[PDB]
Amino acid sequence: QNNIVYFDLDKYDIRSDFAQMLDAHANFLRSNPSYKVTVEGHADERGTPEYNISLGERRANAVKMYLQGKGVSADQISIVSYGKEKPAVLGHDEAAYSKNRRAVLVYL
Amino acid sequence: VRIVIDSGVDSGRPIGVVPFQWAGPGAAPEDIGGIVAADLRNSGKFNPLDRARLPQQPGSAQEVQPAAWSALGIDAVVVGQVTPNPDGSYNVAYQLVDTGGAPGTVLAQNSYKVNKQWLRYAGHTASDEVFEKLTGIKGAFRTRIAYVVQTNGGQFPYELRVSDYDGYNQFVVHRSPQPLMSPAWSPDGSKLAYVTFESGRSALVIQTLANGAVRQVASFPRHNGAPAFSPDGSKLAFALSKTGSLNLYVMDLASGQIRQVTDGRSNNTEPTWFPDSQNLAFTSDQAGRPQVYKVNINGGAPQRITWEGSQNQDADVSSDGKFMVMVSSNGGQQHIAKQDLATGGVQVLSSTFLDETPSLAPNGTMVIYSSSQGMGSVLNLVSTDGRFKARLPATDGQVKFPAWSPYLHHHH
């Protein structure tokens, strides 16, 4: 919950409510130059699998650009879009879709 | 999986398919007549007479009584024989007999010598010959399908599988702890390209089915996916997003040389070949919402070709190049649609929920695709005229990413 950015339908911009959250990750990455974050981007099920990769990518790339704007080296950030392949929750309403439109920061 | 038909048979051409004669004691090793009847029904074009109702059960063309079948509005009858060979193989023979305007004439016949494990194949060959003789369309009954099954739980929840088009003779191509995407057939039917996330990121690979050999195609940073083999056997199209958005690339299979085909800031993916092995249809979001575009790999700007609804994507071009099927969206629903590539005319084919990844049978008469039923993905069939609808239910796991094989150039 301190490592997930959520997005509206066909939106990929970093909302203010996630700024503080991401700032903490940027602080950690700057202070620890050997660590790499992987940003895993996701889409909801509406659409098609290969195209929806791009919706996950735009979300994950937005996190990357935000972190780079906070001084993080490009080589400490990787992105991997899972498109609609790895839903957080099952379901066919906005409750599920909103939970699934996300970028997750993980230290693997 | 197995085929369950939901609608469309009643309107089909009535035909008589008689149980095949068996030269031995007890039951035949396989029900060849049953295979032929099922295949013809599965095509959406035929209505085989129920066994409760056969007016006679002739074991040869000479035993056919044409009048018994014209009385029922049946203008053709399939009869046949299965016989054992001393080497342990079988002969499977059929005769297609006219019971209409040329009563008693044999329209087609053949015999196949097969081992016990290839008896279904023999049945499908008979079906293919009957189907082509009567309809003028090449049969697809000897084809296979590829698909991904995702189980709940286990170390390897994702499996890429292959079966005959009707579900029989299923086997596992690859098991994975992470998602598998977008299997694509080589035109010789020997290989599948597919995407795996098992390494922690996407990799695009080609696997040879007979021995499991794997060739790595691409695992650049970001996405590597959406493969499609050219019909001429020379190239693989695919999408990579290493440049910052999805773009199309082509690999010369002989040399392994990769060439970039698109370089837009837009996303360009889901390529599908035209029959010439030079033109692709593909999805681009250049215009805003996804639409289907066409481009020649050798030069020129992509041209938008779709205007249906609000959004169109994920196309599959027919083997003759006359039409494509695709996923068309609005407002809040998405279905399989067919577009005539000469006129721009469109017909929506399906009414199921969250329709995706349509793949045409090699004779262009049938579409396999995936939809959502309850909480999970399932496989569906719809004819290209929209009249015939069926499903391929599985006993366990979600089923998705179907791909129909090309024609041919414990197993049973």
From Swiss-Prot, chain A:
OmpA-like domain: from which residue to which, for each copy? 1-107
Q: Where in the cell? A: Cell outer membrane
Q: Which UniProt keywords apply?
A: Cell cycle, Cell division, Cell outer membrane, Lipoprotein, Membrane, Palmitate, Signal
Superkingdom of the organism of origin: Bacteria
Question: Could you mention a single GO BP entry for this protein?
Answer: regulation of membrane invagination
Instruction: Indicate yes or no for the key word Cell cycle.
Output: yes
As for membrane topology, the entry says: Lipid-anchor
* Family per record: Belongs to the Pal lipoprotein family.
Q: What does this protein do?
A: Part of the Tol-Pal system, which plays a role in outer membrane invagination during cell division and is important for maintaining outer membrane integrity. The Tol-Pal system is also required for polar localization of chemoreceptors clusters. The system also appears to be required for the activity of several outer membrane-localized enzymes with cell wall remodeling activity.
Protein name as catalogued = Peptidoglycan-associated lipoprotein
Query: What is the species of this protein?
Result: Escherichia coli (strain K12)
Q: Which residues of the full protein are shown?
A: 67 to 173 of 173
Swiss-Prot record, chain B:
Region: TolA box; residue ranges are 1-12
Q: Has the keyword Cell cycle been applied to this entry?
A: yes
Sorted keywords for this record are:
Cell cycle, Cell division, Periplasm, Signal
Cellular localisation: Periplasm
Report a single Gene Ontology molecular function.
protein domain specific binding
| Gene3D superfamilies registered for this protein in UniProt | TolB, C-terminal domain, TolB, N-terminal domain
Q: What happens when the gene is disrupted?
A: Mutants lacking the tol-pal cluster suffer delayed outer membrane invagination and contain large outer membrane blebs at constriction sites and cell poles. Tol-pal mutants fail to complete division and form cell chains, and fail to process denuded peptidoglycans at the septum.
A single Gene Ontology biological process assigned to it is:
cell division
Assign the protein's first listed, main location to one coarse class. periplasm
The answer, when asked if Heme is one of the entry's keywords, is: no
Q: Give the function comment from the record.
A: Part of the Tol-Pal system, which plays a role in outer membrane invagination during cell division and is important for maintaining outer membrane integrity. TolB occupies a key intermediary position in the Tol-Pal system because it communicates directly with both membrane-embedded components, Pal in the outer membrane and TolA in the inner membrane. The Tol-Pal system is also required for polar localization of chemoreceptors clusters. The system also appears to be required for the activity of several outer membrane-localized enzymes with cell wall remodeling activity.
Q: Which proteins does it associate with, and in what oligomeric form?
A: The Tol-Pal system is composed of five core proteins: the inner membrane proteins TolA, TolQ and TolR, the periplasmic protein TolB and the outer membrane protein Pal. They form a network linking the inner and outer membranes and the peptidoglycan layer. TolB forms homodimers. Interacts with the peptidoglycan-associated lipoprotein Pal and with the C-terminal region of TolA. Interacts with the trimeric porins OmpF, OmpC, PhoE and LamB. Can form a complex with Pal, Lpp and OmpA. Interacts with colicin E9.
UniProt comment concerning the protein's domains: Effector proteins that bind to TolB can both negatively (Pal) and positively (colicin E9) regulate association of the distal N-terminal TolA box with TolA by influencing the conformational equilibrium experienced by these residues.
Q: Could you say which protein family the record assigns here? A: Belongs to the TolB family.
Name of this chain's protein = Tol-Pal system protein TolB
